Design a protein around this nucleic acid. Structure first.
Length: 177
DNA sequence: GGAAACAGCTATGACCATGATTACGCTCAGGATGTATATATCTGACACGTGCCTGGAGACTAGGGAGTAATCCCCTTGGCGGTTA
């Protein structure tokens, strides 16, 4: 049981704290909310005191709290609704390539929205030392064969990501019928 | 019957109210003053003719400024979300 970092949109920080209490009450988590002073007593007392397991913050708070969070090495950076990361220049991306966690569990509700460029934008922060490349990934696959429309080289895209990534749909396993 | 005590009357002073007087201002007076006005007469400067000539106005060629098309890509724009001073 160690240091954990999870991120939720402002509207959703209640739910994750609510569900963690309902299901596994043994984990120390905070909703890191409040004012500049009201975030401080969280910083020095509990966050600096290493008196927690997970920390629930918002999109901007981590940017507001980048410096007091670097000094704590993490286990995962749990990223719900990972849509702000679609842009590499979205400032949240440059604040997350700076933290040092052993694993980096990105989470989403919907997959990539528009482009292959976007796909490895999610993918490049997953295993950065492996790719370390931006346009190399792109012209390697050449955008679903945008010129020849072979639509068979897409199988190579699928074959790497199938044992590297997991999709399930509601229609298959209803759970709601 | 005498003495004290109080009450009412009287007078006088004080204070307020009214009348007059005066002084000052101003607004009429009236004088002083300076300004407009008109006129008749100089006069110098502005306007106009004359002559002349050289810039202005065509007349002509030639070569690149300006003008357009096509292209693109970067940027401004706007609404929001969430903070905070």
């Amino acid at each position: 049981p160690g240091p954990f970092l999870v991120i939720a949109p402002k509207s959703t920080l209640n739910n994750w704290l609510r569900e963690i209490n309902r299901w596994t009450p043994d984990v120390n988590a905070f909703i890191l909310q409040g004012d500049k002073e009201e975030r401080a007593e969280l910083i020095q007392k509990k966050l600096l005191g290493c008196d927690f397991d997970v920390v629930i913050a918002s999109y901007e708070i981590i940017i507001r709290e980048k410096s007091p969070l670097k000094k704590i090495n993490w286990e995962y950076i749990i990223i719900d609704e990972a849509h702000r990361i679609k842009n590499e220049e979205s400032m949240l991306s440059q604040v997350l390539r700076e933290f040092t966690s052993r694993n980096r569990l990105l989470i989403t509700g919907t997959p990539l929205q528009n482009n292959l460029h976007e796909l490895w934008a999610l993918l490049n922060f997953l295993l950065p030392d492996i790719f370390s490349d931006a346009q190399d990934f792109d012209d390697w696959f050449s955008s679903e064969s945008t010129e020849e429309d072979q639509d068979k080289i897409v199988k190579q895209l699928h074959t790497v990501l199938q044992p590297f990534l997991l999709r399930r749909i509601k229609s298959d396993v209803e759970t709601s019928l």
